[PDB]
Coordinates of C-alpha atoms in Angstrom, one line a residue:
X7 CA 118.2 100.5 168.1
X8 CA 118.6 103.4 165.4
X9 CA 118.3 102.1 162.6
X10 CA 119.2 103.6 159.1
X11 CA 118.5 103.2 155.2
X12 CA 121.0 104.7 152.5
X13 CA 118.9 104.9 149.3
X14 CA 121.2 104.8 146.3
X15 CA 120.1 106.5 143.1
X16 CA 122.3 108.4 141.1
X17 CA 125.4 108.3 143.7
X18 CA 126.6 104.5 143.4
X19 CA 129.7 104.7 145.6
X20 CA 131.0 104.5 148.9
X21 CA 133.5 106.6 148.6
X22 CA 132.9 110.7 148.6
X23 CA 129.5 109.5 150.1
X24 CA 128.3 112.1 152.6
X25 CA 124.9 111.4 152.9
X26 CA 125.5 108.1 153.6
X27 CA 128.6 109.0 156.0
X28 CA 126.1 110.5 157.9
X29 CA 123.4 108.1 158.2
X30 CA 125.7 106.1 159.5
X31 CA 126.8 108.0 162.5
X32 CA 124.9 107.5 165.4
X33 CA 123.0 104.4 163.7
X34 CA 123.0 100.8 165.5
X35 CA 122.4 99.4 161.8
X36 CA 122.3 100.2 158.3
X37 CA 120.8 98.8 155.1
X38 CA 121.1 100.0 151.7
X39 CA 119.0 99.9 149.2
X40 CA 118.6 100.7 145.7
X41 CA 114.8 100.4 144.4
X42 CA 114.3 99.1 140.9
X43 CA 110.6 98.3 139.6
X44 CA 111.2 95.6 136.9
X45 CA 107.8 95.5 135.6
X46 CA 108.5 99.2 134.6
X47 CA 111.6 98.1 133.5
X48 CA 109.6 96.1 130.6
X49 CA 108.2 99.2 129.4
X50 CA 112.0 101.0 129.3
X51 CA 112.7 102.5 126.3
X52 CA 116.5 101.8 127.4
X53 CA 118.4 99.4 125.7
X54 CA 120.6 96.9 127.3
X55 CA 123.8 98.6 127.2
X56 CA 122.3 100.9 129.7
X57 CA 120.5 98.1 131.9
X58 CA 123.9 96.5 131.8
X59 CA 125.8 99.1 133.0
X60 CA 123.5 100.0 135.6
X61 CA 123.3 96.6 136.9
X62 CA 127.1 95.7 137.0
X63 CA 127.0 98.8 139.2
X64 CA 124.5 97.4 141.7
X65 CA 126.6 94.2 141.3
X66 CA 129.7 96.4 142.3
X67 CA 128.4 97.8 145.2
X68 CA 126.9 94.6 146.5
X69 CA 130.7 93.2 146.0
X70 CA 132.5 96.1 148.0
X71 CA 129.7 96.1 150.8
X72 CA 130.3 92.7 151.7
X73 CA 133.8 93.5 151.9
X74 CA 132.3 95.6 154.8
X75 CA 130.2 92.3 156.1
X76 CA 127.0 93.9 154.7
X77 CA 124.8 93.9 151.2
X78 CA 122.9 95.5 148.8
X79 CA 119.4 95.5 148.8
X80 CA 117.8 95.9 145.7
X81 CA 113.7 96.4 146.0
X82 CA 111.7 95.6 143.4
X83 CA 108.5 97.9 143.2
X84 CA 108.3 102.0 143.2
X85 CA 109.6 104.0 145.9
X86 CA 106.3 105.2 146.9
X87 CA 104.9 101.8 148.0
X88 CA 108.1 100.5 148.8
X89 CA 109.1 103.0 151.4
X90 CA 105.9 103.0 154.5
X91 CA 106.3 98.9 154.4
X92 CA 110.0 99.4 154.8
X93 CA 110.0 101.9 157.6
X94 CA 107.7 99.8 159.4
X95 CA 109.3 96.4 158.8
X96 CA 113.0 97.6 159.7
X97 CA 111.8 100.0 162.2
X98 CA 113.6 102.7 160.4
X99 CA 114.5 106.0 161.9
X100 CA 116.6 107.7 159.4
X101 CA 116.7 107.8 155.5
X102 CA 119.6 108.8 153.4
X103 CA 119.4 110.6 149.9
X104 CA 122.0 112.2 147.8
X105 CA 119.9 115.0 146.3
X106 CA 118.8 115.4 142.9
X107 CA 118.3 118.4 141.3
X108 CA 116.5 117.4 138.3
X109 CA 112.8 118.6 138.3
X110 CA 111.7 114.9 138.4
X111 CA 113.8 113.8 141.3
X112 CA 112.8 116.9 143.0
X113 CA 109.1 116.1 142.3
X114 CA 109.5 112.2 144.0
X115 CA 112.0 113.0 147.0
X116 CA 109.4 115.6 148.2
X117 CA 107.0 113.0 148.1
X118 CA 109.4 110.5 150.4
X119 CA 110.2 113.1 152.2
X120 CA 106.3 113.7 153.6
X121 CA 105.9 110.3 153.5
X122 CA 108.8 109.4 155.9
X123 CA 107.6 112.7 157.8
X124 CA 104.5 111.5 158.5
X125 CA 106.5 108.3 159.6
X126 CA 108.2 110.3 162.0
X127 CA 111.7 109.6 160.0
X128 CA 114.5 111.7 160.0
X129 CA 115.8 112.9 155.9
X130 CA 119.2 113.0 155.5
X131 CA 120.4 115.0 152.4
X132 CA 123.1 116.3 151.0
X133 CA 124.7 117.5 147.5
X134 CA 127.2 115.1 145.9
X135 CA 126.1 114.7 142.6
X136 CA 127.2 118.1 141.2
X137 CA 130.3 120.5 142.5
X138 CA 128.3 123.3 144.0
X139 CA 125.0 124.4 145.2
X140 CA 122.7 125.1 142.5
X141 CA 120.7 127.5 144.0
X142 CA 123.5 129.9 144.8
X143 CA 124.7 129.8 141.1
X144 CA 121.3 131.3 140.5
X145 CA 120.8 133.9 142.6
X146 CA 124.8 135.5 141.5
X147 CA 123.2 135.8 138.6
X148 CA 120.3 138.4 139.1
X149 CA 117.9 135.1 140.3
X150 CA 118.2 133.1 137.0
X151 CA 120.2 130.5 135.7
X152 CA 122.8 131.7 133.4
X153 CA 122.0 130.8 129.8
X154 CA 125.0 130.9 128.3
X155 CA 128.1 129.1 129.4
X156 CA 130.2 132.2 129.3
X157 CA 127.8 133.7 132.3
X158 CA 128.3 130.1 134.3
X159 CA 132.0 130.3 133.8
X160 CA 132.1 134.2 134.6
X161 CA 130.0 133.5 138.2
X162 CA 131.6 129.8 138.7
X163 CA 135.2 131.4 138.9
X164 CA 134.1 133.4 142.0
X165 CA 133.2 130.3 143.5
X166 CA 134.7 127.4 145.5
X167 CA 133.3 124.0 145.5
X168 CA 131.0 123.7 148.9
X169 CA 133.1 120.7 149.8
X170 CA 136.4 118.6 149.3
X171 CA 135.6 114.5 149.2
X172 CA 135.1 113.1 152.2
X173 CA 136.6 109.9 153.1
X174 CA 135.5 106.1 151.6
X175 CA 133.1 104.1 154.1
X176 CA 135.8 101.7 155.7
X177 CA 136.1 98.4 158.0
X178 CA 136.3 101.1 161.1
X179 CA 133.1 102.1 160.7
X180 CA 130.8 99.2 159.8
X181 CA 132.4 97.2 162.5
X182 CA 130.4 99.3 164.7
X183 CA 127.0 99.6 162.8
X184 CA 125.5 96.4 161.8
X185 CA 123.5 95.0 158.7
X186 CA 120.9 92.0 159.4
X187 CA 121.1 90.1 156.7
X188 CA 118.9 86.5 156.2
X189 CA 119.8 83.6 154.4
X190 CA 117.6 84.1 151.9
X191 CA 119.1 87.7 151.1
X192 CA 120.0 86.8 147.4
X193 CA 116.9 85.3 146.5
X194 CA 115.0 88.4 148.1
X195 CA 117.1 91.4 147.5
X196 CA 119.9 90.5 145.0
X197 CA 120.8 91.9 142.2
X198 CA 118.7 91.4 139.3
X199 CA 119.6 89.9 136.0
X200 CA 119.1 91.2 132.4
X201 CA 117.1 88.3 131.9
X202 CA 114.8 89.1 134.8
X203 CA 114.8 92.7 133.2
X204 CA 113.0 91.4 129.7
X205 CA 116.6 91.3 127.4
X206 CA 117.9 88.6 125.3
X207 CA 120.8 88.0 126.7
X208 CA 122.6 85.7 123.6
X209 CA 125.3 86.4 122.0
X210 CA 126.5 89.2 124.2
X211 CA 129.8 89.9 124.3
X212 CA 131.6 91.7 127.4
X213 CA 131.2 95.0 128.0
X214 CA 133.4 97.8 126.5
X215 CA 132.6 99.8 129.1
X216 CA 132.1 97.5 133.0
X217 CA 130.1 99.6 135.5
X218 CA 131.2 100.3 138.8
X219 CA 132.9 102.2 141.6
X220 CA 136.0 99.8 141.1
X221 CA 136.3 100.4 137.4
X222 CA 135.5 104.5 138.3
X223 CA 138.6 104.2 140.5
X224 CA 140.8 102.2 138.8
X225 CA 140.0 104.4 135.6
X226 CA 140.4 107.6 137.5
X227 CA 144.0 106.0 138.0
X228 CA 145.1 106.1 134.5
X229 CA 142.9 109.1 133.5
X230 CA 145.3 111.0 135.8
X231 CA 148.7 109.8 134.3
X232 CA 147.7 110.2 130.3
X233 CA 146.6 114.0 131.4
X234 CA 150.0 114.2 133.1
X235 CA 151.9 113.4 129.8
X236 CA 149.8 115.8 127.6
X237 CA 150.3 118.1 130.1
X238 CA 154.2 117.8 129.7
X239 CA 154.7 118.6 126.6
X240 CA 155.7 115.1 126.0
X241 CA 156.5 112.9 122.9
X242 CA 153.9 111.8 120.5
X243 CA 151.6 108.2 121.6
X244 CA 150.1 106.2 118.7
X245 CA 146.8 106.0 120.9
X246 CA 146.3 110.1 121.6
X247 CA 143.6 110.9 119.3
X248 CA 141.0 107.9 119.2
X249 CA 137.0 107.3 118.3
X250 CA 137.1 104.9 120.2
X251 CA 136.3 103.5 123.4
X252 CA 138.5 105.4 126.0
X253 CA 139.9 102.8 128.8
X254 CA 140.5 105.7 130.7
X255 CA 137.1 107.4 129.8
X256 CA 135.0 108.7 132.4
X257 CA 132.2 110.0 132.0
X258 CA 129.5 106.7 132.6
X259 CA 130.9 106.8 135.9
X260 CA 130.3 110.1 136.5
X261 CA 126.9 110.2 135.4
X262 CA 125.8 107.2 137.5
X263 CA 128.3 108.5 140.2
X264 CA 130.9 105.4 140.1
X265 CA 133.4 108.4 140.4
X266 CA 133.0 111.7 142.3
X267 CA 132.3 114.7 140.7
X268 CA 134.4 116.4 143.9
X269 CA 136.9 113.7 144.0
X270 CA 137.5 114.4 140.1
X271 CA 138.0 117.8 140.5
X272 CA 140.5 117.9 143.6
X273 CA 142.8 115.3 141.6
X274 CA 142.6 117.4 138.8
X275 CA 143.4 120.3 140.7
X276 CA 146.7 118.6 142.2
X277 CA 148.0 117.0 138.9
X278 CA 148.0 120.7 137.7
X279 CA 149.8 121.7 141.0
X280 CA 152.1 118.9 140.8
X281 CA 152.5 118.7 137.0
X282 CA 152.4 122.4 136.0
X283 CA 153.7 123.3 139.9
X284 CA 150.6 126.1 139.5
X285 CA 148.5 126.8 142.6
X286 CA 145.5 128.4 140.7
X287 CA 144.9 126.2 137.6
X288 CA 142.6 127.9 134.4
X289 CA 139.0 126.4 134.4
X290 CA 139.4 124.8 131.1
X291 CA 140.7 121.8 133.6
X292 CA 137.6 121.7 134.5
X293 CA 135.5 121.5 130.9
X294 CA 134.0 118.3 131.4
X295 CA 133.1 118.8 135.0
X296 CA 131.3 122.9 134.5
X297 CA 129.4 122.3 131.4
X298 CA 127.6 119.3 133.7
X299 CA 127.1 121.8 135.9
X300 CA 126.0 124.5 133.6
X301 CA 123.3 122.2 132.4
X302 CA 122.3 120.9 135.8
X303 CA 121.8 124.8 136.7
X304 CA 119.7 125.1 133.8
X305 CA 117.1 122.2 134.0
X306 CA 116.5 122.6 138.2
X307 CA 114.0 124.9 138.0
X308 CA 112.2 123.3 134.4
X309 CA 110.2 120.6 134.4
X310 CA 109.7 121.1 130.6
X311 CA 113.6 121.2 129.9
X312 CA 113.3 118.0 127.4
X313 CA 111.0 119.4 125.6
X314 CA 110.4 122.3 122.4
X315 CA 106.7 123.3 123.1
X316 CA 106.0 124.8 126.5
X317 CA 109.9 125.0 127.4
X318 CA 110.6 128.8 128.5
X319 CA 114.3 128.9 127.3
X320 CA 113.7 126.9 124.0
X321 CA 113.5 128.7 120.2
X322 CA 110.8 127.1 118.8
X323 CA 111.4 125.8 115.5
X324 CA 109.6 124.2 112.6
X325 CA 111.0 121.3 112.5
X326 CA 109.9 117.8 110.0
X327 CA 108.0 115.1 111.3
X328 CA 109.4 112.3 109.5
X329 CA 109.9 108.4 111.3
X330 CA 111.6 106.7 108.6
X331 CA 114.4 109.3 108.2
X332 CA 114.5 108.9 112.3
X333 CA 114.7 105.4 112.0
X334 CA 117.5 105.5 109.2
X335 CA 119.4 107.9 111.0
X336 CA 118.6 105.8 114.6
X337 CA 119.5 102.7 113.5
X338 CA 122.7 103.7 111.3
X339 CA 121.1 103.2 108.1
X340 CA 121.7 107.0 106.5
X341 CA 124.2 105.5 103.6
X342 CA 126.8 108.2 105.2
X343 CA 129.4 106.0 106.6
X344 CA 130.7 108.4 108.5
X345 CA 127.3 109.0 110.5
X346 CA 126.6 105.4 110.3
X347 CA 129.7 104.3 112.1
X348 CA 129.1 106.8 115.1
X349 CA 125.5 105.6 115.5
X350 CA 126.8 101.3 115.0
X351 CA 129.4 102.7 117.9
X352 CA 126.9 104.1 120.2
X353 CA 124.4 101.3 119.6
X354 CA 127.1 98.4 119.9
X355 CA 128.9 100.3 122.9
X356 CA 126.8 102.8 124.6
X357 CA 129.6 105.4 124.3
X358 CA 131.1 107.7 121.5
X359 CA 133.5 110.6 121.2
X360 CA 131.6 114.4 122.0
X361 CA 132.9 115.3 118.5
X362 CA 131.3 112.4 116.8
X363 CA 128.0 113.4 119.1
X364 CA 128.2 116.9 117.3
X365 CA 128.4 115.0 113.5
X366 CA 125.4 112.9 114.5
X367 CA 123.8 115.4 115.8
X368 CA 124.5 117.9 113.4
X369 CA 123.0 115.5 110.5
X370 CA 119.5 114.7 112.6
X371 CA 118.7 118.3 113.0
X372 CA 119.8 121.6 111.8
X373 CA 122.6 120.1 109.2
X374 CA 120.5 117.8 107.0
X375 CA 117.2 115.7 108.0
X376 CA 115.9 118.7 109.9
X377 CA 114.4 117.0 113.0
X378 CA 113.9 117.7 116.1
X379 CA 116.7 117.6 118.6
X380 CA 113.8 116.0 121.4
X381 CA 114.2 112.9 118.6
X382 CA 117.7 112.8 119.3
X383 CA 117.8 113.5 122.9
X384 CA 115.4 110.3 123.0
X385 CA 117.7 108.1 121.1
X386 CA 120.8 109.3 123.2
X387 CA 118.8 108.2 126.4
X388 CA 118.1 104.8 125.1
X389 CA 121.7 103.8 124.0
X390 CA 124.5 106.4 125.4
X391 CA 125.5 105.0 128.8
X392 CA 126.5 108.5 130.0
X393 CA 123.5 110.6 129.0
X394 CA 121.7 112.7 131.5
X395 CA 118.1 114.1 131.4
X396 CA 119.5 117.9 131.7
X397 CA 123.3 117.7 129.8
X398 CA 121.3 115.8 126.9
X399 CA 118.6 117.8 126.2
X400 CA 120.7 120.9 127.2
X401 CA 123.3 120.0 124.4
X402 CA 120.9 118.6 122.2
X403 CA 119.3 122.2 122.4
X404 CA 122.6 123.8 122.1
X405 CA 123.8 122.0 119.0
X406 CA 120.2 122.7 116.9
X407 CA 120.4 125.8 117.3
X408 CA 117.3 126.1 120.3
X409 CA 118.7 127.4 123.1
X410 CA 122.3 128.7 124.9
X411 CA 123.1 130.7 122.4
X412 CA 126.9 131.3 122.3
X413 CA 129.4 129.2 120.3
X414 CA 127.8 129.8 117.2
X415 CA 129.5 127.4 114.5
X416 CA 129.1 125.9 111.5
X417 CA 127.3 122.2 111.2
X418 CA 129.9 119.9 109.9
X419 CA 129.9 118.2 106.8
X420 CA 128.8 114.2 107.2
X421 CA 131.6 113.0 104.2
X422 CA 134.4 116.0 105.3
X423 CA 134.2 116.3 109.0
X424 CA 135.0 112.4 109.1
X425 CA 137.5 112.6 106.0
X426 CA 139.3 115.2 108.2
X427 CA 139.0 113.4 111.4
X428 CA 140.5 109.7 110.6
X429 CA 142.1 109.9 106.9
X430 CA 142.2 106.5 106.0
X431 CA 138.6 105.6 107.5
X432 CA 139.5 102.4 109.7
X433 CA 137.1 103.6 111.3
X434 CA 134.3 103.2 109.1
X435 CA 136.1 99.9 108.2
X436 CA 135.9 99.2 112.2
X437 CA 132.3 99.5 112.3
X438 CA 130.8 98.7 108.9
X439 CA 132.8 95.8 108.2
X440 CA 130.8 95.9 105.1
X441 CA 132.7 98.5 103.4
X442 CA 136.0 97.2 104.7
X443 CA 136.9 96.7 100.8
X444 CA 136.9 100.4 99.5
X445 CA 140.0 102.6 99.4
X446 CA 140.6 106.0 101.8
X447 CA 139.9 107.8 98.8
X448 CA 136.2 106.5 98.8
X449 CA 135.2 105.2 102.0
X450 CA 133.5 108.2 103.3
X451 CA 131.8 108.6 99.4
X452 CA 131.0 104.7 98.3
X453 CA 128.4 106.2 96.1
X454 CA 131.3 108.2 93.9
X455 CA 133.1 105.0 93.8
X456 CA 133.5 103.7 90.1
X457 CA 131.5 99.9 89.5
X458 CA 134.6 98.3 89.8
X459 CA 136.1 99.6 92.6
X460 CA 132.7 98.5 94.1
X461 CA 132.7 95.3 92.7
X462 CA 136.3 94.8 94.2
X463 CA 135.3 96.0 97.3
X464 CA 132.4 92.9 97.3
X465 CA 129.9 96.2 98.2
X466 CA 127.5 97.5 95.9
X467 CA 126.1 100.8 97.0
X468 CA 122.3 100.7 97.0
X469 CA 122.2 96.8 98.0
X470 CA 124.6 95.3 100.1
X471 CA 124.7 99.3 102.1
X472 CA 122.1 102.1 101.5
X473 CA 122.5 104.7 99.0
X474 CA 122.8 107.6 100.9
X475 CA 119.7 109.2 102.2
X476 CA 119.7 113.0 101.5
X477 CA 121.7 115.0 98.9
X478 CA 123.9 116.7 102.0
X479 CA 124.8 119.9 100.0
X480 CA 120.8 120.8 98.8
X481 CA 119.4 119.7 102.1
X482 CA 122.2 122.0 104.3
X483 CA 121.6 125.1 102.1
X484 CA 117.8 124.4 102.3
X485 CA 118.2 124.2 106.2
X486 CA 120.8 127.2 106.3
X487 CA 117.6 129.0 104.8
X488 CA 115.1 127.2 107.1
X489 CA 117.2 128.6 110.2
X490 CA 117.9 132.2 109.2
X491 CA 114.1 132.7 107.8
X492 CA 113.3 132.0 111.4
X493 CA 115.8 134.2 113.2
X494 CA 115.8 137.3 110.4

């Protein structure tokens, strides 16, 4: 017998799946497995929102591969342990890996990769996590990365992606390659619960946003026909400009790969050719998808990339060091209602809209409490379902200030930005309830609301919701100084 391991990570699909495609051929039997340590997981600084997510994806995959007459196996420890005993106890002759570019998952898949040498195992790898090669982005461009996004978009146009998706792992195919499975499987290798993980688990209501390749693709679906109808000019929808939770929002199942990054693109490209009956669309199509990439390009070569001191392609800046303002701002607590709201959103939810990123973002660092985007980056890891080690601390970097320097704007304002973005402020009603009583004309402002108006509204400023914590036009003028004393 040949037999074969598929090790998920980051690509938690079985459709667009060539590495796994291809640890299949020529195997008599397959297993895979997706390695999670939950004694680590203890120690996470990830909240649930993540965890959950992450295991309704396992769950998901564990559902569609017994479709197949096979299962999941989730192995608890740490891949370098876990891997010689499993080589030897399956009698494995091939591994499968999507590849990761990040310095990190570089640094641990060379280490399987010696270990499972020195097993005499054969490495299967291939790149379906990102559009192109990395690598050959870097040397069109004189052997770097491009650091700006311009530069990426100037070399990506001269560029195809390596690959259009390959086909979904079907009944055909697993007929004829086998997965021994005990009767103890679940109580060995099933899916774990939060519980097991260390969370609470009471009072949880469902998720906003369910993980998995059949939400991805069910998702994908719908993305496809609201794009068609802005695409056609079409007639106004009372749901076309939300803050809210998108339920045809994509990008968590990108970023655990639920959905293909190559699969996105090529429907993309045919609802422009179908919808705008245009062969060669313009790359703003592809926004979403290129500025992944750009940052993925970025961080490969960088094992410092989330970081100010030591990183190569970071302006180092003198920034505060200041935990209860981080707290405040963390835990939605800056008396801004309009900052508040976005950070109550991405704690309840895991997920808010990229311009309310750039508000909260703005306010942490170069806009008003002047801290460092790494404190930022942090929080987006532990509670933004779609976050990714390079786009986080690539756009964190961007919107401080430190780094890709191009698009140089203005940092919005924390009452107006959100005044201009939802008028009458349900949603700071949606989200702090507790300010549900004050008018539009002082929702985003509750401290320049007159006694009675708060007294009405059953919220007085200062007690039942905080004052707010800085004086926004001093401390932007202050840090409008700060930055151009530093770059003069």
């Amino acid at each position: 017998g040949v037999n074969a391991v598929h090790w998920f990570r980051k690509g938690l699909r079985l459709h667009d799946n060539p590495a796994l495609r291809e640890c299949i051929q020529g195997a008599d039997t397959v297993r895979c497995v997706y390695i999670l340590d939950p004694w680590f997981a203890g120690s996470s600084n990830v909240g649930i929102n993540r965890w959950r997510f992450l295991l309704q994806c396992l769950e998901d995959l564990d559902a569609n591969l017994r479709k197949l007459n096979s299962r999941l196996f989730v192995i608890r420890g740490q891949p370098a342990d876990v891997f010689p005993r499993l080589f030897k106890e399956w009698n494995i002759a091939k591994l499968s890996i999507e590849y990761d570019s990040e310095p990190f998952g570089k640094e641990r898949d060379a280490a399987i990769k010696k270990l499972a040498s020195e097993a005499g195992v054969e490495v299967i790898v291939r790149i379906s996590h990102t559009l192109y090669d990395l690598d050959k982005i870097i040397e069109l461009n004189g052997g770097q990365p491009p650091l700006t996004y311009k530069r990426f978009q100037t070399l990506i146009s001269r560029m195809e992606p390596l690959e259009m998706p390959v086909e979904t792992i079907t009944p055909e195919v697993m007929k004829k390659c086998t997965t021994p499975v005990s009767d103890d499987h679940d109580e060995k290798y099933g899916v774990p619960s939060l519980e097991e993980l260390g969370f609470d688990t009471d009072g949880l209501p469902s998720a906003v946003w369910p993980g998995g390749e059949t939400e991805a693709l069910t998702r994908l679906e719908r993305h496809l026909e609201r794009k068609a109808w802005v695409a056609n000019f079409e007639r106004p929808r009372m749901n076309a400009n939300s803050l809210l939770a998108s339920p045809t929002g994509l990008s968590p199942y990108l970023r655990f790969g639920c959905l293909s990054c190559r699969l996105f693109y090529f429907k993309l490209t045919d609802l422009y050719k179908k919808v705008k009956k245009n062969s060669s669309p313009p790359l703003s199509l592809y926004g979403q998808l290129l500025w992944r990439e750009f940052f993925y390009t970025a961080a490969t070569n960088n094992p410092r990339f989330d970081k100010m001191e030591g990183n190569p392609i970071c302006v180092q800046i003198p920034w505060d060091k200041n935990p209860e303002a981080l707290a405040k701002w963390a835990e939605g607590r800056t008396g801004f209602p309009w900052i508040d709201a976005i950070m109550t959103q991405l704690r309840q939810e895991g997920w808010i809209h990229h311009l309310a990123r750039h508000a909260v973002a703005c306010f942490l660092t170069r806009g008003d409490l002047w801290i460092s985007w790494e404190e930022g980056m942090k929080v987006f890891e532990e509670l933004l379902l779609d976050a990714d080690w390079s786009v986080n601390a690539g756009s964190w970097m961007w919107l401080s200030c430190s780094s890709f320097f191009q698009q140089f704007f203005h940092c919005y304002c924390p009452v107006g930005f959100g005044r201009r973005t939802d008028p009458n402020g349900d949603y700071i009603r949606r989200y702090l309830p507790v300010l549900r009583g004050f008018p539009a004309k002082y929702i985003y402002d509750p401290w320049n609301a007159p006694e009675s108006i708060q007294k009405a509204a059953k919220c007085i400023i200062g007690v039942n919701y905080p004052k707010p914590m800085v004086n926004h036009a001093e401390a932007s003028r202050l840090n409008i100084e700060r930055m151009k004393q530093i770059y003069q």
